[model samples]
Target: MAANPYERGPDPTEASLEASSGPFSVSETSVSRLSASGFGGGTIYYPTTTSSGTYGAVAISPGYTATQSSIAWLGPRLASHGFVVITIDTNTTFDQPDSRARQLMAALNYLVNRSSVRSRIDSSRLAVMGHSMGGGGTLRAAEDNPSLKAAIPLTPWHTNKNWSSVRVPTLIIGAENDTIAPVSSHAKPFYNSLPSSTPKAYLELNGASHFAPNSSNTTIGKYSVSWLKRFVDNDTRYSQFLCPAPHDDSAISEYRSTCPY
Candidate 1:
């Protein structure tokens, strides 16, 4: 007669990221090189929370002509929630979506194989995220590498005709007022087009510009941490936030989901 803890419900607890600055001291290390695919120059953030536990990994790519600083907040924000977060740069910011995708993969490789913090990560649990052009690259990376655990493309600019083939769980964020990649033109269509079988959701930020994720609005970080925890880390504790977002949360103008978990 009791509810099953394994089943996600609307009344499930909301784990606030604000309450989640991990007790582990956070630290950063440089990823110096990737010989074959990309520059591989970037920073990796991981926990001094412990020297022994293996954590999930996430690599973030910023858009065209953007610096690592654009999405840099994510490295610590996510690492604090128990992921090894790598924020990277393409050899040049003008790199094509395909190239940026490869750069992100290279960053992940460096995070798991060469970094001093490598020993603290579980190589099997990994995810990818990107903004604008970089977000399109995130889609491409997920397209090319179907084995990735999850993908979150923020205001992504690319639309794949064959996205119906991608099977990874995904969360796509779009800015309601974004002129760069209008929702109808890019985000909405991209969200609509993914393989119907893949678990997915789209969150449209109210009155947001293309740079929503890179800004100080902490709500973006909140949903972001939940998506990765739910899908990449497979932690059910964050699932409630993914569905039935709190009633008073007004920043989001529109949110849609097909994630059945």
Candidate 2:
């Protein structure tokens, strides 16, 4: 067992409960040194618990030019909520296919094999989240792997195809002012391609910049916690966070779905 990574640091957002619920134990480690898919080997950040039984696991892929360090702020947040959060470094450049997705699956398999973390982790309650280029990688991973229970892609790049193959619940968050992954190039095509049958949502933050709504943002982080609570924990309060009914203006403005399409 590794020592907790968050044990020594003062809580970064202690002033705001909205940023995190409370202090939680965390540990960072490299799962593998070689890439399972033969592209580039990457490290995985593992944030675990010493007390409670693990509830679930989240595997995150980093965006282009961003390393596992970029998601360091977010991984522990999920761990606090009783999840074994895993962050992986993906080899991502402009229009490059990341084999790190396969590495994510490999990590999942590794966790499931461990006696301490295996049964604790609800294999049925798994999610994959990514930012920017990482967002695109998550979609590709989920599409290829059916075991994923949910996915959340933040400011993703459009792959120019329908993502109907993704059967899990998905939430796509987009920034209104992002030029890197514009609404038309990313969110629009991605949203339109999704099937109405699966649980889905599209959120456009009116004033957010490309990376403004990251895990560091108190509001966005809280919302993400709530989203995972609903999908991963089966909490009904956050259920509405998923699919919004048609003709419901409030729900319409808050969460866009493929219902009426």
Candidate 3:
């Protein structure tokens, strides 16, 4: 989104392909403290030797009152696909989006300074993701740090829904029937607030609740992996999956984007 605003959103390769080298596997570890922020609740997932390659980082957080385990599926899914992934917990479940944003940044900082295999990560390349309040925080982090490669906010919720300054390529997955943070009030407007120069998209899952993003959704992962690959990893080969192959899956209810590429 930073450089290619009109590029597509969802890629079929993401839906149908694995988005990683063969025999995808991961080795995981946990970090207790961050030297700068002192924030804890970090779970690091790194791709195994079978998938030897430097990768970007994806920092993640969960909704209010939800632990990192709520989105645990993302760690292995993203890491096995070759991204240095970290899922974190906030100081408290009641923390707001801005606080979560700060924590997410702190987690990335921790990974840069404390990872066991620091070579596995290209610290300069990064992405952020979260659900509900954490999702909103993802946007906040990208807004505050425009250099971020991308972000995906599923069922994002927040105290302030205005973040027009954000320029990161973002994928906003919403729930068609979500009552907690309905697409009508939260997801839709949030997607609209981003500058049109920002490559952005909105996918609404039919009949899904607010907690839909908390579970494993292969469709979301496929695109998410592709997003980081294309934007963070700067690989154009992943662009083919981003367009001209609209998904017919039963899970998707609505999809809209400026995916001209």
Candidate 4:
């Protein structure tokens, strides 16, 4: 219905969420490092039309020792769902979580203020996401900036475990078989540490590893689309995919959250 003014795309079904791409036609542009400021250059993937009105935006970071290429698949996947998505490279491959946090914000700022897609974005509705250390950066960015609509940290790794200060709607994805940044330490503790008052969720991938998020996995894409749509666009029509808590699939080892948002 028109009750949710920000809603884009058709009503979502289980099959829609599991698909590699969504309803909109997507276009891409590359931001070169030579012309960039704050963060390294990145690729901007966006819905090709403005007929539906401005869409929310998100800046994503690659994990430590990784480049934007590692997270590139997310660009068109999320963009086609009706968002301006930027998958960014860090200032350096070795940068820490806190540094990546700042870079994520920089990338968003670039998207809203300087990028070619600025006119297509609703600046107030924005979010951040990342993998491993970059995922840790997503949490830090959310904690540092509460105005963020949502955050998704896939198999995040951060040495500072306590995240009680964060109020952003967050979804932390963990991998069951990860030895690099095991769920027992990274994702679980971080998710548990977030304020219960904040809309949040923890999804553990059954039999997956730390590198699982590096590819285009169906489970990660499904819940991630739900999280972003529910929070960023305030599209509650997508809520059913999340709040009964999605447990029937063997792809998920565990799922936890503060429901009824």
Candidate 5:
């Protein structure tokens, strides 16, 4: 098992999609604050093979009062799945959603234009993700950047709910027991407000909290990878895990989608 035959191979199975890490090998590099502008510099995780050609890229933001280390698990996890993933720090820990949104865009630009892994990324194939207020920022980023391939906002928090402007494919993950940013007030309405024409889905994590996305979670991991692969990579092989909708199993309290996308 030293080598992954299915690194970018076809015929993906449910088991493969559900695994903690994917077939590709990943390597990481630090982006220091001194070198990065517009946002606090963080870390980038990229697939180590050039044979796969340029890979899609994603930039992730942590919740308020948090640092890149909070969402650090996703960097390697997503990169191992064949993405150029960046987990960033905001200009400041107290930065709001709107600020986080700009920072997300800045991070993506940094990834494709200035990072050491720049050559490994496909600028046209890009996405954004975040947690809490950072998750709210993810929606704003998608709304403002329709050219983006995908967006995943985890237990997002925002004052405004109407996201009809978002055309990019998006997946909103909500935590059922999240008292801070309750699904009823935050995630659900945000998902509902998105244009039906836009490829979208809402996943409510069962008995979870606002911080569920801050760690290495299986449900979040699998679905995040699926959405990124389906949209960012244009890989239909990963669609099976998406369409027909995921069931309300122990891990998931509820699921909704504009299926057959």
Candidate 6:
């Protein structure tokens, strides 16, 4: 498939801030000697911190048309929380089966093998997140690799059968006004396909378009960080942030509903 024409381009200000003033030690690097399951060559953003303990890691796949730089806002945030963030540049095709998920697995493997990252990275606490085409890619990766502790598909692509195979904890964030990947198409099916026994949840953001939840807005970042802290980092207090409750305003009005199974 072709790239989404609506894809957001790089922001000079955001890029500069992320590169310089961001909290984590951010750097761009490539893994040449290692082999990946998805695309052959791609760039990865590594955000590190000096916290002396095992921290969780996140492998983020941007939207289909988005480059590795599109998710620049997230790396520094995750890094500040003391989690290693790895973002991948995926092949820009729309629906074709690509190596994105495989590439993520390869990145995970590479990080686990490195002594500096290995000791700080808690392999068992791994999560994958993506938006649009990349969101679909996260579902595929979770299915392809059952070891993943959690998967977050933000405004993901629906109609993919691979979601039925996801066995880990999953959080689906949908946009009510998003026409690109309609709510029913991907979110509903994915929510239904997930077995009742698996730890799963879904949220629909009201009046939010495809890109709103991922913007520079502090609230969205806090929501995302909270989710990762709960499922990915095993923080019990953060679990409350996992899904919206029935009576809360944010849960009732801003977001649709949540399935905390």
Q: Identify the leading candidate in terms of TM-score.
A: 4
User: For model 6, what is the C-alpha lDDT against the true structure?
Assistant: 0.64
lDDT by residue (148-231, candidate 1, tens digit) is 999999988875634777788889999999999899899998888897788888899999999888865566777887888788
Cα shift from native, residue 54, model 5 (Å): 0.6
Candidate 6: 10-residue stretch with minimal lDDT: 5-14
Question: Candidate 5 residues 1-261, lDDT tens each?
Answer: 315322364456667767888888889998898788889999999999878578889999999899988899998889888899999999899999999999999999999999998998889999999999999999999999999999999999999899999999999999999999999999999999999999999999999988889888999999999999889977876776788446524477678777668
Clashes in model 4: which pairs? none
Error of 5 at 248 (Å): 19
Highest lDDT scorer: 4
TM-score of each: 0.84, 0.74, 0.84, 0.93, 0.90, 0.73
Write the number of the candidate with greater lDDT, choosing between 2 and 4. 4
Better of 5 and 6 by TM-score: 5
lDDT of 4 at 172: 97
Which scores greater on TM-score, model 4 or model 6?
4
On lDDT, who's better, 2 or 5?
5
Each model's total of backbone clashes? 1, 0, 6, 0, 0, 3
Ten contiguous residues minimizing lDDT sum, candidate 1: 4-13
lDDT of 3 by residue, 68-142 (tens): 889998888777666788899888889988999998888888787777857777778889999999999998999
Question: Candidate 2, residues 1-261: lDDT per residue as tens digits?
Answer: 314321212322324337554355665555544532422333433435554445667877667777777676777676665566777665443333245556566556655564244655767777877788777766777788766777887787645457888877778888889998997788767877888887777888887877864557665565566567667766544444344354335445555556555
Q: Give the candidates in order of TM-score, highest first.
A: 4, 5, 1, 3, 2, 6
Model 3: lDDT of residue 173: 88
To one decimal, what is the Cα RMSD in angstroms of model 3 from the true structure? 6.6
Question: Which is better, 1 or 6, measured by lDDT?
Answer: 1
- Alpha-carbon RMSD, candidate 2: 7.8
